[PDB]
Amino acid sequence: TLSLQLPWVEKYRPQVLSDIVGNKETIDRLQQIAKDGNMPHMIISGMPGIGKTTSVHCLAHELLGRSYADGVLELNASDDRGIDVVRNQIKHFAQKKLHLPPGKHKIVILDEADSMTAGAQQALRRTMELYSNSTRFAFACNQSNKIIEPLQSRCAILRYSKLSDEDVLKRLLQIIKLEDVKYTNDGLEAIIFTAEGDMRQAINNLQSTVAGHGLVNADNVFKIVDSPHPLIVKKMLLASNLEDSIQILRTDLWKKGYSSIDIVTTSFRVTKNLAQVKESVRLEMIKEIGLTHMRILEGVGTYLQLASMLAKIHKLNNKA
Amino acid sequence: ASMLEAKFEEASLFKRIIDGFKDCVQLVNFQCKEDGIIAQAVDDSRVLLVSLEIGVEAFQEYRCDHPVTLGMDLTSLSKILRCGNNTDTLTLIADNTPDSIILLFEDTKKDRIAEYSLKLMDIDADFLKIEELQYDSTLSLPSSEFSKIVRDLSQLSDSINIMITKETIKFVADGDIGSGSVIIKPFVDMEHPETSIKLEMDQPVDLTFGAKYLLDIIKGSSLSDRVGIRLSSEAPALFQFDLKSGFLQFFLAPKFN
Amino acid sequence: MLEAKFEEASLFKRIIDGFKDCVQLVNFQCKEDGIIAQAVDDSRVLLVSLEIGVEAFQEYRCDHPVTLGMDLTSLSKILRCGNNTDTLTLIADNTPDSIILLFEDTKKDRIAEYSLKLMDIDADFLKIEELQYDSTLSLPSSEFSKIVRDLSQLSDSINIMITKETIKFVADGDIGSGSVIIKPFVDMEHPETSIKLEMDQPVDLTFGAKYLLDIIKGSSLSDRVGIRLSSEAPALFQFDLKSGFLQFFLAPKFND
Amino acid sequence: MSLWVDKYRPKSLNALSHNEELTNFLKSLSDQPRDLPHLLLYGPNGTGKKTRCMALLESIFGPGVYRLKIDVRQFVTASNRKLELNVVSSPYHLEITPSDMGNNDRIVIQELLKEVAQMHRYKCVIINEANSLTKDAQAALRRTMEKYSKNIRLIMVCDSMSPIIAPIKSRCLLIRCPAPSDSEISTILSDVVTNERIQLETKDILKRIAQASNGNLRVSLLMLESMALNNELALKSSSPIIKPDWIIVIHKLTRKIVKERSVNSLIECRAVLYDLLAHCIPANIILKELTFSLLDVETLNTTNKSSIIEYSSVFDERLSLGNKAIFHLEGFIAKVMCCLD
Amino acid sequence: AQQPWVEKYRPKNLDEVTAQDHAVTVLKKTLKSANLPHMLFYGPPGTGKTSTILALTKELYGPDLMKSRILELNASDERGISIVREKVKNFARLTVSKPSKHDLENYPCPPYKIIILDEADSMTADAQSALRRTMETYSGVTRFCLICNYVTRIIDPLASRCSKFRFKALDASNAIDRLRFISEQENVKCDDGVLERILDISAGDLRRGITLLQSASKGAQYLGDGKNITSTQVEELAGVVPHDILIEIVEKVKSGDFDEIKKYVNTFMKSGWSAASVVNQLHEYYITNDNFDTNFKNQISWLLFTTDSRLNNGTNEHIQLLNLLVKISQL
Amino acid sequence: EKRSKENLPWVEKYRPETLDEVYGQNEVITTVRKFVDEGKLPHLLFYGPPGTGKTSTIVALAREIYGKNYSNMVLELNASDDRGIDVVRNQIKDFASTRQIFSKGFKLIILDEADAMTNAAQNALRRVIERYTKNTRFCVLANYAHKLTPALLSRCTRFRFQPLPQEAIERRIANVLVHEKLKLSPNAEKALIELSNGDMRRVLNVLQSCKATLDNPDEDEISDDVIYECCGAPRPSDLKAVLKSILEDDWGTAHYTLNKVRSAKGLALIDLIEGIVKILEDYELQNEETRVHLLTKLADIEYSISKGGNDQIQGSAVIGAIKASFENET
DNA sequence: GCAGACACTACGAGTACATA
DNA sequence: TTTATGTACTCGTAGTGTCTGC
Ligand SMILES: Nc1ncnc2c1ncn2[C@@H]1O[C@H](COP(=O)(O)OP(=O)(O)OP(O)(O)=S)[C@@H](O)[C@H]1O
Ligand SMILES: Nc1ncnc2c1ncn2[C@@H]1O[C@H](COP(=O)(O)OP(=O)(O)OP(O)(O)=S)[C@@H](O)[C@H]1O
Ligand SMILES: Nc1ncnc2c1ncn2[C@@H]1O[C@H](COP(=O)(O)OP(=O)(O)OP(O)(O)=S)[C@@H](O)[C@H]1O
Ligand SMILES: Nc1ncnc2c1ncn2[C@@H]1O[C@H](COP(=O)(O)OP(=O)(O)O)[C@@H](O)[C@H]1O
Ligand SMILES: [Mg+2]
Ligand SMILES: [Mg+2]
Ligand SMILES: [Mg+2]
DSSP states (O other): OOOOOOOHHHHTOOOSTTTOOSOHHHHHHHHHHHHHOOOOOEEEEOSTTSSHHHHHHHHHHHHSSGGGTTSEEEEOTTSOOOSSTTHHHHHHHHHOOOOOOTTOOEEEEEESGGGSOHHHHHHHHHHHHHSTTTEEEEEEOSOSSSSOHHHHTTSEEEEOOOOOHHHHHHHHHHHHHHHTOOOOHHHHHHHHHHHTTOHHHHHHHHHHHHHHHSSOOHHHHHHHSOOOHHHHHHHHHTOSOHHHHHHHHIIIIITTTOOHHHHHHHHHHHHHHOOSSOHHHHHHHHHHHHHHHHHHHTTOOOHHHHHHHHHHHHHHHTTO | OOSEEEEESOHHHHHHHHHHSTTTOSEEEEEEOSSEEEEEEEOTTSOEEEEEEEEGGGEEEEEOOSOEEEEEEHHHHHHHHHSSOTTSEEEEEEOSSOSEEEEEEEOTTSSOBOOEEEEOBOOOOOOOOOOOOOOSEEEEEEHHHHHHHHHHHHTTOSEEEEEEOSSOEEEEEEOSSOEEOOEEOOOOOSSSTTSOOBOOBSSOEEEEEEHHHHHHHHHGGGTOSEEEEEEETTEEEEEEEEOSSSEEEEEEOOBOO | OEEEOOSOHHHHHHHHHHHHHHOSEEEEEEOSSOEEOOEEOTTSOOEEEOOBOSSSSSOEEEOSOEEEEEESHHHHHHTTOOOSSBOOEEEBOSSOSEEEEEEEBSSSOOEEEEEEEOOOOOOOOOOOOOOOOSEEEEEEHHHHHHHHHHHHHHOSOEEEEEETTEEEEEEEOSSEEEEEEEOOOOOSSOSTTOOEEEESSOOEEEEOSHHHHHHHHTGGGOSEEEEEEOTTSOEEEEEEOSSSEEEEEEOOOOOO | OOOSTTTSOOOSSTTOOSOHHHHHHHHHHHHSGGGOOOEEEESOTTSOHHHHHHHHHHHHTOTTTTOOOOEEEOOBOSTTOBOOEEEEEETTEEEEOOOSOGGGHHHHHHHHHHHHTTOOOOEEEEESSGGGOOSSHHHHHHHHHHHSOSSEEEEEOOSOSTTSOHHHHHHSEEEEOOOOOHHHHHHHHHHHHHHTTOBOSOTHHHHHHHHHHTSOHHHHHHHHHHHHHHTTTBOOTTOOOOOOHHHHHHHHHHHHHHHOOSHHHHHHHHHHHHHHHHTSOOHHHHHHHHHHHHHTOTTOOHHHHHHHHHHHHHHHHHHHTOSOHHHHHHHHHHHHHHHHO | OOSOHHHHTOOOSSTTOOSOHHHHHHHHHHHHSSOOOOEEEEOSTTSSHHHHHHHHHHHHTOTTSHHHHEEEEOSSSOOSHHHIIIIIHHHHHBOOOOOOHHHHHHSOOOSOEEEEEETGGGSOHHHHHHHHHHHHHTTTTEEEEEEOSOTTTSOHHHHHHSEEEEOOOOOTTTTHHHHHHHHHHHTOOBOSSHHHHHHHHSTTOSHHHHHHHHHHHHHHHHHOSOOOBOHHHHHHHHTOOOHHHHHHHHHHHHHOOHHHHHHHHHHHHHHOOOHHHHHHHHHHHHTTOSSSOHHHHHHHHHHHHHHHHHHHTTOOHHHHHHHHHHHHHTO | OOSSSSSSOHHHHSOOSSGGGOOSOHHHHHHHHHHHHHTOOOOEEEEOOTTSSHHHHHHHHHHHHSOSOGGGSEEEEOSSSOOOHHHIIIIIHHHHHBOOSSSSOOEEEEETTGGGSOHHHHHHHHHHHHHSOSSEEEEEEESOSTTSOHHHHTTSEEEEOOOOOHHHHHHHHHHHHHHHTOEEOHHHHHHHHHHHTTOSHHHHHHHHHHHHHSSSSSSOEEOHHHHHHHHOOOOHHHHHHHHHHHHTSOHHHHHHHHHHHHHHTTOOSTTHHHHHHHHHHTSOOSOHHHHHHHHHHHHHHHHHHHTOOOHHHHHHHHHHHHHHHTTTTO
């Protein structure tokens, strides 16, 4: 068993703030914090895979250098971050006396901060308020709703947005030029379409296509990784002909190996996130999709139930 | 009458042997043979491996013509050993490929007789031929000293790093409270031969281990007066506790990076 | 009219410790011959009988027959002051709605008096149908509790197969099986550990687990416990006492 | 006790002057009780099903079934919630009801039936109001009576058949209890009053009670006792037919719905419904009474009546699958107001 | 005569199951071999799944090994996720018991033990998901037999792993030999078409037929006239509506007049018949008639189906019956 | 296990022991083989319907990478094992952090049916995967994707296991018949293809039960007739006759025909409903209202049958629904 | 050595969340 | 605030064990 090569997701992880693409204003603000040194408490939020925790790690590396071994305390969901056994850890770390450069402070990376309990954040409130001169915190959560409002009242809100296609394409081309793999622009746009602004997904699909076919042409890309089924569901629900919707359902989901419950949940999510049709029509569509969802969850999962769901969706859509 | 008979001199020996590695292992696979009884068992995390072996000299009487694979459960085994007077003479009894074994908790030497039985467990995992190899180092320190050092260092960090270089043993454990650096210089004493820090040297080793697993190792220090540790960069750590007629190893897997 | 003065404070407490888990409450019936308090469990299976003599437990003065029904939790809470020297005093006047439990200590002059509430039960049935038992067994109670807890930990069903010269205890469970056999052995030097099983007819009855635990909980009542078994009849677990005895009954459930 | 409903109850099948065919069938079962299967008596409430059960019980073993006692049993559930439910036990039988909270009566059934099955060969287990079981204790019962049957027997009493699942219907013998005829109601009331000391001008009062009771003998006896107490132990031919205050509230609600069909009247309807649900009333019977009182209003049309009954069926289906009955009842009243307007 | 006729005549051999010939032959030929797959018995109640599995276990091991190599669970037993994760897993991973010389010589003892999960459709999906890999991993030592009367409650992976044996409903043609045998053994005087009526009323089950036969025989014994049990006594004891009352219901429905049908439904429900039986009688009367138009039959079939489903939900049957009759009356 | 093979069901006897023995998923198998030969193995996520060969593929993969004793070098966790967040914090963390105990290789963690893990467990597993990915690879087998955290989905390479096509089932059946000394008629093979519905375990179970069905295991060939009695599925000719009687014949004839077909060999209304659904999907219907009415009414009927009820009323409902739906078309 | 003192692991009851 | 399992967290308590001491 030979030692595995490090995956391109981790091999080409950025180590400096310049390499992170997307959200130019946020990255420039982070760079100005980096050279300025006056890091405030911040909470970083966004959709997964767009570069949240890597910016935190890069900023922690840049602000303080050889002190990175002991000047930063990183915590995560794998560590049992509770109210009692962990309040002492941050209390000691903030109370720990370590000599920094004049404009640098200790960093407490509470990575994946949306999973902590309420009491832990309640203690962290005064923990942050007391030793603000010595230590600074860095929350990195997918969802900022779990963080209580006292924590939001003393933090710098840094909202990341989903990456534009141009930035993903730019960093992808950088990766190709460092790896020297033959590429076609159609294949690259296929990767961009499949990723949906999720960068790690783009890198993983690039890995699979490169190591599966050598060439990243569009046919090989669509052979290896399938198109995202939310788009297929949205296409199916928006069709005007019932026969067309049924054919799309069967061919693209039932013959491709998709569970009925997955189709129902994706249809519910697409309907609630859809905006072209009238609001009320979306309300009855959601009600019918939920009725079919109850039928599926109660035990009867069949192509017939999905076909009936589509038939009634067309009944509401075509206005009787 | 029964094919497999193993009458211990005292139930205390088997109780101590079972309680030595009861905590760190859930499923045990005994393999009785004419040369003795062995037990190769793996932890749930598949990091710590226990290789019990009891020689024929630790049994007052022993006889087992056909090899027997006794896959068992240590929780229920210890529960069975929990009941019964410790002075009593245990006699392990099993049939030809049976569904259970019989624990003769013969009280004193007469009167009360117990027939506790534990249903045999189907463990299809074969024994692992991890005996030994060319180990880089071979040290030997008293069990009490090692247990005290491990217990002291476990409170300071979650990882204990054992370093051997130029006839010197060094334990370091950097953590949040502090960083212990307990060091030992090898020596030998004729006055008290039990306390002697023996050592061998081929190549320096710097291997780190978890704290909870090392505590699990030192829980078994009551069995042996001496513990022998052998380390290598391309081998799991070996902790050979010497018994009255056999031994009890502890193949611990070091961390990487 | 009731003057059930008890010699030791931590003696009636020792009795109610056994009484606590066998039944939730008892209906006391005090008579000059003795104190009887029998109660029926929630399952109508386990029967508890109480008998307290008059020679010991200080002077007993039961001028009139008094029937009282009360809980044991509050009684234990009041009896928590159970010093080794303290005594007890039971006083029941006309309409004894609140019994005053006087504590007087010989070693110290400190006094303690508490009142116990009385609930309206007025229900007590006393019937002892069977006295003849095929097998009568006396053995130390601590060993009985030990063997019962060891067999009940392994299995939820306990059966006894009494044969010639063997008092066989067997417990079959999913984890395994425990078949502990004890022989009748009497040492004149150690009366407590003496074991005699009188033999008229072999008895094979299958019992439960929680009932056996409740029975063995009151192991400290007697050094030697009288175990009586009768075929096709309720069991009798009689615990001796310095004045009287406490017997426990159980139905031998059997579905084969 | 002084109540006449529980003072004159036929102890034996010989005193069951109610149904000749049903009494003969029960006597046929009691002829050879060595192989009596599990029973399930169904019919309108107030018919006297429990009377037949007790009469059959004393015909199987003998006199002494009618002596009863109370034995509270402590039962523990998930977490440490205490829902100690008493059992009305007795020699030779055992009477249980699912008066405990419906979400966790399954444990009551499981451990109590397992406890009674630890051993005159069988002890009958009567389960009053079996239609209130929540399809979970019935699952336990499926194997409970099937596995242990030579030691335990069930007389499963319920006033409705629909909530009982198919296997329970399959493994239990079905016995039908029709409601009394009006002539039989009058005969029973006449026997009661001649054993009592109430003076009657004419037996037309008994017939009026029979008509108003709608085949329910229990409420018939209750109303006769109330009238006799109110009429100074001498019934009057002009005495108004007294109705339960619940019926009065339902009829006033129906009148308010019929006359005023605005949102505000729906607010007072909601308040009245809140009071009625606070007054220990099941949702099925209140919706049934509201529906049948609405259909009895003469100002309605046949189309409105059909719409009302169809939405009543729909919302009764909703009640059978819902938790908070107030929302379903308010929705039914809203639909009725929409149809009538 | 200490047991009811349902359990007194419960089959004790695999050949005694006089229905489901395919499943019984498959299980017998498997009994000759040792390749017993993870079974999944399903079908209507009373078709004989529990009897079949008990007979199969008894013929496989014998009376001695029932207590050692059989683990039966119910909804009466606690069947949470913890029970599936610990009790079932432990019993599966234990080795098989030791067969004796007598059992091995007389019975074809296989080297596996069967775990029977009766009424398994009541378990939560999480427990079944936990049971999946327990079923898969220890296939060489234990067999799982899932006995549920609803397939849809069983999740897809278990239906994939388990071999499915549908238990067909027992109509008049399939299960007339069993009833004739029971009548011969019990000496029950019978008419010519009485057993056909019993099997017709007992919709797809034999337990109900046996219970009805026992009740009719007990009634005939009480009367003691030595008279053959007619179809009338069985029809009355079965709880089905007599034809006169059904004709009256149809006559009231045909004329309309909501007040009249409401009054008659009130009186009918006062007499207290089971509404499911009334719906069944109305279905077998209206559909089989030839005096009604095609469109009427379509609409009345849909109405009867909707009423039957609503009744099966467990609702108040009075309102459902009145609604069905009024909807039919306006056709 | 006991008595080696020949005492196991055909489901667990014919389990692939090599990546070459997995049929159908040619692309996935070839990509995985290329991955392991080139030395790179990212975090794999196998998604697909039941019976498509996910756990068989990953077991064959672990056997190929490691030695014969793959279970000694792989921490394989399933829903039977407790997988709380404490398990992730202790067992997974210790297995990922430490070095291999039997040889020199990367740790491999296989999480079969990982969709049953809680949200907090997946949240911890996120950072556990991302931190110790240098010498530890995670494989996640999930039938359902909606139960997986999107963070977990964005971390593992997604491989989709399609339902088995005709050729793969035919090849496996040919291998099984070659091994078992069994003969089977091609029409029976086509019936098996239609009955499988993309599942392989169904095929193996039906073959086992049909071999058990035959009086003489040798000599006699398995025809589609034996398949149809052994599985109990309706024959296509029966479905065609029932549908024709419903469409053209009147109520007496259609009801009598459906009852006779059901009572001939004990058919159930279920499997017959979706047989009729397949046949009607094989039709062209001018009016969309016919399709709408058919789908809605048949779904309601199938739901009611799933909840159980009276079979006669449900059959009458099926006939009425079909006949009312094929009259709005004209 | 027996007694107290000591801090440790183990156990039980209570609360709060459950889709983005 | 009822809901009704399963999960996870937190605290509190009861013993159980080895460690100092006279
Ligand atoms: N803007 C970016 N520029 C370059 N690489 C990026 C960028 N965003 C993400 N990546 C890549 O994404 C991988 C890791 O992304 P992460 O920042 O760890 O994901 P994340 O933002 O933390 O989302 P979650 O919530 O943790 S799953 C590495 O391979 C990075 O190279
Ligand atoms: N094929 C059959 N042959 C003979 N008797 C049968 C048959 N099927 C059912 N029975 C009778 O049905 C009774 C018990 O059947 P069961 O096996 O309990 O039905 P079931 O499969 O358990 O239905 P459930 O569990 O309620 S879904 C006994 O009286 C049997 O004699
Ligand atoms: N492609 C295939 N080639 C050959 N046999 C297959 C194939 N797919 C499935 N099988 C068979 O199906 C049996 C069970 O399927 P598994 O692959 O073990 O489980 P699975 O397909 O992952 O389904 P789940 O999701 O785990 S329930 C295996 O033992 C094989 O005999
Ligand atoms: N044959 C009868 N003669 C006189 N009264 C009867 C008869 N049968 C029943 N009853 C009356 O029925 C009442 C009991 O009804 P009950 O069994 O409670 O009905 P339900 O079971 O529907 O609640 C008793 O008060 C009794 O007077
Ligand atoms: Mg991150
Ligand atoms: Mg059954
Ligand atoms: Mg799998």
